[PDB]
């Protein structure tokens, strides 16, 4: 699995709603091209992807 050397989450225009109303961008500098599972570790916010 590719290793994320550093990651930064910046989130703008969040709306708490039934629909996916929030959007966050992760900036990353990993070492190898590949697929990562993205997850939200809270019971209050759920990721679409």
């Amino acid at each position: 699995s590719p290793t994320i050397l550093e990651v930064s989450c910046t989130v703008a225009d969040c709306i708490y709603s039934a629909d996916f109303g929030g959007s966050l961008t992760l900036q990353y500098k990993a070492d190898r091209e590949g697929h990562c599972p993205v997850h939200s570790h809270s019971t209050t916010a759920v990721l679409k992807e």
Binding site: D13, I15, F20, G21, S23
Partner: protein, 48 residues
């Protein structure tokens, strides 16, 4: 003799007088409150 000068050259707020319906055109004097009901088709979601 003593008509003075017409309202085309005397009227305040710099607006010009016409005579076919007798209207004062382009008077810049006050503030207009305005309310717009923009349709939802114009709005796009924050994702896009």
């Amino acid at each position: 003799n003593n008509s003075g000068r017409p309202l085309q050259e005397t009227a305040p707020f710099g607006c010009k007088i016409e005579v076919e319906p007798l209207r004062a055109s382009n008077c810049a004097y006050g503030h207009i409150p305005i309310s717009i009901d923009i349709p939802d088709a114009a709005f796009v979601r924050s994702s896009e």
